[PDB]
């Protein structure tokens, strides 16, 4: 009874054609990943930083430790080519199975096989399918562990000497650390899981997640939902979709904040500096310049009475001054050598700033993630010249948009799933209008 | 201030538990047509 | 004096505000006397001319020009790189006619004070105490009449 | 050209529809 | 044991000066054939007292307690300078550089905010003669400069300022200016303050000293717009001495 | 020289009479500064009557 | 009695030359050979009683004294003005482009 | 108005010898300036040190004068401070520091001439806008 | 850039990532052909 | 060019402060609100008049019966928001009334601006701020922004006036 513009809803009870829809769609995802990587590589120029070149997939591979050496210099582009080709080739196989199951295959699976066939209302079968996929996901998290510990390591922006690829021999297992993250506040100076700042915690979290997913997968293969869960949920295909839409929405919002604040699993060598980073680097830059001229940046009082270069945070830490006072929670490998126990150390600042830190501050200040939609870099009043929008702005905005619409999609399908399960999703029965059998409010 | 902190932690926890147990208490069944 | 008083932006009907109520005297005050015509010169004896405030602007900078339109003095906002200050240019003011006829002023803050008034046109002495005038321009009956009738129409 | 390839690729999709419509396929 | 940044951050400990153990009752001897510097001077205020105005004649108001509203942003630290031995054996500390100022605003009863530039800029502090040793009864007395709380570029809310900004009340084009001159003409004040530092602990091995201080100075005058208040500041201090 | 009765205060003295003497802003009618009256300040009494 | 001291300074030689006691360090770029090195020394060693005092800056090479000698006519000295030298404002007076 | 040889004529050295660029050279120098310099020097200012700009009168007063092709090509190989006293290859992109500033690696000698030429030409076209900052935007 | 041996396909690669967009557009040609049933 | 016209009116007329504009804003945003909330209400109080999952097909333009329940809509909004419409004629008149009246009101304010009869200032605020350099509001902050707008756009926006503002007269905060 669905119109053409809701035509994919005709697939709800046709398990075979829906399988083809899904597998064909999965081919599309794999195709883009293969095609986009090759497009990026074809355009790549190694002498330019990646973030000056509109790259979003090559940075993901380099972060896994392929193609790069110390300082994030690209040493070898062949791993990029391989990742692209292999994804590209694999989409043809997914495409093939996809359109076979959608056009030629059995329309409904339940007659061909009792293993692959399913009823949405079959709570036992649904949790088994769920369980299988939890195991797949657990295996996937373990592959990242395997790469970090047994197959060459990961890129580590914190590595001494400017960053490098590093094998992770002691992943964090202490659950006070791992789950400690899940209980940190999401507010400033804490930042929930987005504050993860070392590969040992990253690798250790994926060991934990891998095991938990596999355990839960086996759990749900072996059990059926308990009655308290049976009475709490709507059990239908559209309900299930609505649940996943909400989960994807939450996940997109998290990824948005991850790429905007985190410079560990999104190294600034590849993705450009974060907004906080670039703002801290401007204060560093003019600190350095003015001090070279003879300024005593420690004792310089600015117009407001606060320090022109240096001030205190609300809890006393010595921090950069100006509007960047808001960004003092920023930590980055070019800045940390200047920190002592009370914050920025005036003696290190006077004596120990290195040329590579002056360079990196100047580079990051001039690549702040500000730009126009037509890719003019800098503040909105800047003139044309610099063709630049940060990969972080591209990745943050795109995934905020997608996360928002998926929350709307959650609301849409959750409300309809509820109304359809109760039997009034098509409208009110004229002969049995509930309100007409209720007492008036006044 | 800590008296205030504890009081608010307790009040927020209370209202959150009402919310969660309330929706766990057969909410699909509270509609005017088909309650199951 | 009657003709000079017409050459003064405080009588311009497009200088009021919607909720600035009452007579024009309540704003700049009751006009008492024409102070005279202010003539500005730099240290080289060049006669300078104050750029007059256009009706669009609630506020306007103090810029002094020569007969050819070249900027020769101003009151600077940022002082550190000022090139055209009254202090640097030795700007003076001399009055002809009116109440200050034949008087010349050289001290920079007095000279600036008359330059701030010359953007309004001819310079007048006002009684601001009698009506407790607040110093903010109001429109004339020409303005209020036009406003009401265009809105009713 | 780049426009030669994208023309051939772009022509493929609608050509499938046409072949099936002209042969009364399962559209 | 030593604390790292990640131990301190967010605790408030970053605004606290290092303390000495209550056993540190030694003495640091002074070799006049030797030059000395203060490698670090740290001053942590604990109490802000503001003098009231008694409006009347010879009553003279007292210093009243105030509440701090600007949080843990008050300490002076990393101050260094020469420690000179004088002809009479008095020592004189000459401040050279460091984080030697903090804007502070405290609230008096009734809600008046009093901002001040808590500082020891250009501090010169001396001892009594014939010191020869820094002990748990050595006092340092001195004076320092208190520059204007806002510096020359600061613009008031109508855009008026000293080295920048408008020179008149542009929103009142035909108001008489003489009533407005105090608000229209900014001035930069430079006053003196006084400070006592009382050494109460001395680590004779390491050259660390710690103790108590009281300073007196003026609060903010908003570039001449109003009269300042007198302020009394008490706290603790720490300093480390090195052979120069 | 400027007590409440010079200021046309009418209910203030009835709160003072039975023991309410300080304000949340830290002054007291006796002239003492730096006092904390707790809830039962002049402000708290006013609030209580509104509720 | 209420006078803007910065405006008053614009009426002295400060308003026409590089005031060795007051001017921000960026102004030494107007003449060749002065920035940044000699500018740094000049500012660190202020104030000066006479324009000729800058030749007595300890450590000058003969080439640096030659640069200074050639530029003495573009220098001046007035009384130090607290408002212009506080805040480290001779190194950064809040003016960029 | 158009790009005439007269605007495309710039000083080659301090002696006053001149060179006339082609339009091709100008457009190429502009592209290379954007590629390797504009992130800090857009419009002739210096974002990380606004006290020093690329205006002709500024370059003329640098030691080594830099208001000519030779002085600019040399600056791109071995940049110094404004008074000539210190070499700054370690914090300023140059051929001498192309290992740490990788965009400088694939620049040829003729590219340096084109970049230098664009810098000398552009103030002839834009006037005060070149190196003037947001005031003239 | 792509490895030398594949440089022949460079213009093809500049076009490939658009291809998934063509599947969405193709769905509306298909519905145009059967009349939005 | 219309975007330029918006910003001109802020900088020169302080048009956002004008109560006739504010009534216009309330009429346009109130109109859009009414549009969305009425459309959503009808679509979510529909009667089941067909069996399809697409509910559009179950309406006939010559049918006498209301296609949605006013009674259920009224109870929903009464319990959600406190009040609801109960009269279909009043509701649709009100939908006419709100955006029309809003636009008429903004027109009146622009007639005032034809004469520079602006609602530019609050005299009490200006008197206090002139005498008390510590007094600051969002009102005084916005006028500083208008003053920047005027000085920085006027030379290029009114080229016939031949405004020459030397850099030293331009109002600017610190650093920027
Ligand atoms: C199911 C029911 C769910 C109900 C949950 C109810 C509680 C939800 C609370 C959410 C609101 C929290 C606001 C977060 C504010 C903020 O600071 O959030 C940002 C934080 C990240 O925090 C930042 O984290 C940073 C981590 O970086 C640090 O560590 C890095 C390591 O590389 C770097 O070194 C970096 O320099 C260093 O600072 C720092 O701590 C910063 O100080 C800190 O601000 O993100 C986060 O915690 C990530 C997740 C936040 C998502 C919030 C987005 C909300 C989207 C609203 C949706 C709109 C919907 C429309 C409805 C219609
Ligand atoms: C995993 C994600 C997912 C899945 C599987 C579904 C699945 C379904 N949805 Mg849901 N939906 C989702 C996400 C999802 N949705 C999100 C995120 C939203 C909010 C935006 C919605 C909002 C929504 C509504 C409002 C409705 C559905 C409906 C449906 C059903 C029919 C849809 C159909 O045939 O579309 C047909 C597809 C189209 C008409 C194409 C739409 C074109 C889009 C909107 C524009 C694309 C623009 C793109 C960004 C750029 C284009 C570039 C250009 C060059 C082409 C089906 C069961 C319908 C329903 O209730 O069925 C029960 C229904 O009415 N969905
Ligand atoms: C990722 C996107 C996606 C996917 C995978 C599907 C998949 C499907 N749709 Mg949906 N649909 C979509 C988007 C999508 N749709 C959008 C955007 C709309 C809005 C216009 C619709 C509207 C819609 C309607 C109205 C209906 C469907 C139906 C169907 C199913 C049967 C279609 C059929 O018989 O085709 C027959 C068409 C052909 C045989 C023509 C050729 C089609 C082939 C597959 C093109 C392949 C081209 C490609 C280059 C081949 C590569 C081969 C390579 C691997 C070797 C199928 C599972 C139908 C359904 O549910 O059936 C009950 C149905 O009635 N869809
Ligand atoms: C969803 C994630 C995502 C993100 C973050 C990016 C981000 C980027 N891409 Mg990629 N891209 C994506 C998906 C994504 N793309 C997809 C799905 C395709 C296939 C068509 C491509 C194909 C593609 C090509 C072919 C190219 C890029 C390029 C770029 C860069 C410039 C983007 C630009 O100017 O857009 C301009 C902005 C728009 C067009 C706005 C569209 C907004 C829509 C219409 C509204 C959204 C409605 C809702 C969804 C930037 C790094 C360019 C580049 O620099 O490559 C090196 C480039 O040439 N991308
Ligand atoms: C999740 C995706 C998915 C699912 C659930 C199914 C399910 C099904 N398919 Mg379909 N199929 C898929 C993907 C999928 N297929 C793909 C990708 C292709 C293209 C190769 C096909 C092509 C296809 C054809 C041509 C046919 C089916 C048929 C069938 C049915 C019987 C299969 C059987 O007996 O097992 C056979 C089991 C095996 C051969 C075990 C081998 C395990 C595989 C090959 C390796 C494991 C994959 C690994 C975990 C991940 C991939 C690696 C990659 C990431 C690098 C069953 C309903 C049949 C049918 O419906 O007939 C009426 C049929 O003829 N399928
Ligand atoms: C894709 C993942 C996935 C999905 C969809 C499900 C789905 C389901 N599980 Mg399984 N589960 C999973 C993974 C998953 N599980 C894994 C990996 C494990 C191993 C740890 C388990 C272990 C497990 C057990 C032990 C049980 C289930 C049960 C259930 C059912 C009830 C779920 C429920 O009411 O939760 C709704 C959630 C709650 C009622 C409590 C919420 C508590 C969270 C932590 C609050 C936090 C919210 C906050 C905003 C986000 C921050 C997170 C915080 C921790 C920092 C449902 C079928 C139940 C069942 O019937 O099994 C037979 C059951 O008893 N699951
Ligand atoms: C065409 C009519 C008209 C005009 C142009 C004038 C003009 C003038 N009068 Mg006169 N006056 C009039 C009618 C008029 N008057 C009438 C009818 C009365 C009797 C009430 C007076 C009584 C009067 C007195 C007592 C005084 C003046 C004075 C003045 C002068 C100052 C006016 C002033 O401050 O305005 C102020 C105007 C406003 C602040 C505008 C208010 C309009 C509001 C904002 C509109 C409300 C809109 C409404 C809510 C719309 C919502 C509709 C929606 C629900 C649909 C000026 C020359 C004064 C003067 O200087 O005398 C010597 C003086 O003291 N007038
Ligand atoms: C930021 C990382 C920069 C990039 C990229 C480029 N330049 Fe630069 N430039 C920069 C600074 C901080 C300075 C001042 C250096 C100093 O301390 O003196 C400069 C200076 C110049 C100059 C001298 C200008 C003068 O008035 O004397 C020139 C001629 C110059 N820079 C040229 C130049 C070129 C050609 C660039 C691209 C190849 C380039 N710069 C990039 C900062 C940065
Ligand atoms: C169902 C359906 C649908 C859908 C569909 C789909 C979605 C599908 C997919 C499909 C797919 C998903 C496909 C794929 C394909 C692929 C391929 C076919 C590939 C190939 C490859 C190659 C051949 C490559 C080559 C190369 C190399 C190897 C190297 C480098 C270079 C190059 C690139 C050249 C639609 C909507 C339409 C309609 C309705 C129905
Ligand atoms: C990897 C990693 C890591 C780790 C992580 C982890 C460990 C995680 C976990 C996570 C988790 C563990 C999560 C959880 C979540 C949960 C949730 C999200 C929930 C949900 C809920 C809901 C949704 C519900 C609802 C409801 C209610 C409330 C009532 C009744 C009805 C219902 C049921 C509907 C780290 C960070 C270290 C680092 C990096 C990496
Ligand atoms: C990788 C690769 C490959 C593959 C490829 C493919 C996969 C393709 C596909 C393709 C496709 C997939 C295509 C499609 C296309 C389509 C189109 C072209 C469409 C169009 C459309 C239109 C234009 C529309 C219109 C309309 C309608 C119809 C209705 C409504 C209205 C409108 C107007 C919208 C090959 C083989 C080459 C080899 C090499 C590599
Ligand atoms: C859906 C199937 C997708 C399969 C993707 C696997 C991609 C694996 C790429 C591994 C790259 C290794 C490169 C090492 C040097 C060659
Ligand atoms: Fe209607």
Short mmCIF file of C-alpha atoms in Angstrom, two decimals, chain C:
data_model
loop_
_atom_site.label_atom_id
_atom_site.label_comp_id
_atom_site.label_asym_id
_atom_site.label_seq_id
_atom_site.Cartn_x
_atom_site.Cartn_y
_atom_site.Cartn_z
CA UNK C 1 22.57 85.56 12.30
CA UNK C 2 19.27 84.26 10.90
CA UNK C 3 20.95 83.12 7.69
CA UNK C 4 23.88 81.56 9.57
CA UNK C 5 21.44 79.67 11.82
CA UNK C 6 19.97 78.02 8.71
CA UNK C 7 23.44 76.75 7.86
CA UNK C 8 23.49 74.42 10.89
CA UNK C 9 22.67 70.73 10.86
CA UNK C 10 20.75 70.89 14.14
CA UNK C 11 17.92 72.52 12.16
CA UNK C 12 18.04 69.80 9.50
CA UNK C 13 14.78 67.81 9.87
CA UNK C 14 16.49 64.51 8.97
CA UNK C 15 18.60 64.48 12.16
CA UNK C 16 15.96 63.38 14.69
CA UNK C 17 14.75 60.11 16.15
CA UNK C 18 11.37 58.49 16.58
CA UNK C 19 11.35 58.55 20.39
CA UNK C 20 13.33 61.77 20.90
CA UNK C 21 10.30 63.78 21.97
CA UNK C 22 9.47 67.46 22.19
CA UNK C 23 10.91 70.64 20.71
CA UNK C 24 14.29 70.92 19.04
CA UNK C 25 15.29 73.23 21.92
CA UNK C 26 15.13 70.19 24.24
CA UNK C 27 18.06 68.69 22.31
CA UNK C 28 20.86 71.08 21.41
CA UNK C 29 19.30 73.84 23.58
CA UNK C 30 17.87 77.30 23.05
CA UNK C 31 20.13 79.09 20.58
CA UNK C 32 21.46 82.36 22.04
CA UNK C 33 24.05 83.76 19.63
CA UNK C 34 26.17 83.01 16.60
CA UNK C 35 29.74 82.48 17.79
CA UNK C 36 31.20 83.58 14.46
CA UNK C 37 32.65 81.84 11.45
CA UNK C 38 35.50 79.48 12.29
CA UNK C 39 38.54 79.56 9.99
CA UNK C 40 41.10 76.80 10.42
CA UNK C 41 44.73 77.02 9.36
CA UNK C 42 47.70 74.69 9.70
CA UNK C 43 51.19 75.79 10.72
CA UNK C 44 51.97 76.80 7.12
CA UNK C 45 49.07 79.26 7.02
CA UNK C 46 47.06 77.08 4.66
CA UNK C 47 43.33 77.52 5.18
CA UNK C 48 41.69 74.18 6.06
CA UNK C 49 38.02 73.17 5.78
CA UNK C 50 36.13 70.82 8.10
CA UNK C 51 34.27 68.06 6.23
CA UNK C 52 30.60 68.54 7.14
CA UNK C 53 28.47 65.81 8.67
CA UNK C 54 26.02 64.21 6.19
CA UNK C 55 22.49 63.67 7.43
CA UNK C 56 22.84 59.85 7.35
CA UNK C 57 25.47 59.74 10.12
CA UNK C 58 24.71 59.77 13.86
CA UNK C 59 28.45 60.36 14.38
CA UNK C 60 31.18 61.45 12.00
CA UNK C 61 34.98 61.83 12.12
CA UNK C 62 36.70 65.22 12.21
CA UNK C 63 38.60 65.57 8.93
CA UNK C 64 40.11 68.81 7.62
CA UNK C 65 40.84 69.36 3.97
CA UNK C 66 42.37 72.03 1.76
CA UNK C 67 40.59 73.86 -1.05
CA UNK C 68 41.63 70.95 -3.30
CA UNK C 69 40.09 68.25 -1.08
CA UNK C 70 43.38 66.87 0.24
CA UNK C 71 43.34 65.71 3.86
CA UNK C 72 45.66 67.89 5.89
CA UNK C 73 44.55 67.32 9.52
CA UNK C 74 42.16 65.16 11.51
CA UNK C 75 41.45 63.95 15.03
CA UNK C 76 42.98 60.45 15.12
CA UNK C 77 41.46 57.36 16.67
CA UNK C 78 44.63 55.27 16.95
CA UNK C 79 47.29 57.74 18.08
CA UNK C 80 50.42 55.65 17.66
CA UNK C 81 50.71 56.05 13.88
CA UNK C 82 48.88 59.36 13.48
CA UNK C 83 50.24 61.65 10.76
CA UNK C 84 47.60 64.41 10.66
CA UNK C 85 46.98 65.33 14.29
CA UNK C 86 46.17 68.93 15.17
CA UNK C 87 49.25 68.84 17.38
CA UNK C 88 51.53 67.75 14.53
CA UNK C 89 49.95 70.13 12.01
CA UNK C 90 49.74 73.19 14.28
CA UNK C 91 46.07 73.72 13.47
CA UNK C 92 44.56 76.94 14.81
CA UNK C 93 41.10 78.48 14.62
CA UNK C 94 40.15 82.12 14.04
CA UNK C 95 36.64 83.56 14.28
CA UNK C 96 35.15 86.33 12.12
CA UNK C 97 31.80 87.91 12.87
CA UNK C 98 29.52 86.89 15.67
CA UNK C 99 30.42 86.63 19.33
CA UNK C 100 34.06 85.52 18.97
CA UNK C 101 34.88 87.94 16.15
CA UNK C 102 38.60 88.58 15.91
CA UNK C 103 39.62 85.96 18.50
CA UNK C 104 42.11 83.22 17.64
CA UNK C 105 42.74 79.99 19.53
CA UNK C 106 45.90 77.92 19.34
CA UNK C 107 45.73 75.44 22.21
CA UNK C 108 45.00 72.08 20.55
CA UNK C 109 42.12 70.89 22.77
CA UNK C 110 40.26 74.16 22.29
CA UNK C 111 40.90 74.06 18.54
CA UNK C 112 39.64 70.48 18.41
CA UNK C 113 36.56 71.42 20.40
CA UNK C 114 35.48 73.96 17.74
CA UNK C 115 36.41 71.53 14.95
CA UNK C 116 33.98 69.01 16.47
CA UNK C 117 31.22 71.62 16.27
CA UNK C 118 32.12 72.77 12.74
CA UNK C 119 31.02 69.43 11.29
CA UNK C 120 27.50 70.66 12.20
CA UNK C 121 27.92 73.85 10.13
CA UNK C 122 27.98 77.33 11.69
CA UNK C 123 28.70 77.39 15.42
CA UNK C 124 26.18 78.67 17.94
CA UNK C 125 26.01 79.36 21.65
CA UNK C 126 23.19 77.37 23.25
CA UNK C 127 21.34 77.62 26.55
CA UNK C 128 21.01 73.99 27.64
CA UNK C 129 20.10 74.64 31.29
CA UNK C 130 16.67 76.25 30.89
CA UNK C 131 15.03 73.19 29.33
CA UNK C 132 17.53 70.70 30.72
CA UNK C 133 18.53 69.92 27.15
CA UNK C 134 20.17 66.54 26.64
CA UNK C 135 22.35 67.37 23.63
CA UNK C 136 20.73 65.04 21.09
CA UNK C 137 19.18 66.33 17.85
CA UNK C 138 15.40 66.25 17.42
CA UNK C 139 13.41 66.75 14.24
CA UNK C 140 11.28 69.77 13.33
CA UNK C 141 7.53 70.17 12.74
CA UNK C 142 8.34 69.64 9.05
CA UNK C 143 9.64 66.18 10.00
CA UNK C 144 6.81 65.23 12.37
CA UNK C 145 4.14 66.40 9.95
CA UNK C 146 5.62 64.44 7.04
CA UNK C 147 6.02 61.31 9.16
CA UNK C 148 2.44 61.30 10.45
CA UNK C 149 0.83 62.01 7.09
CA UNK C 150 2.85 59.50 5.10
CA UNK C 151 1.95 56.83 7.67
CA UNK C 152 -1.76 57.77 7.72
CA UNK C 153 -1.79 57.79 3.91
#
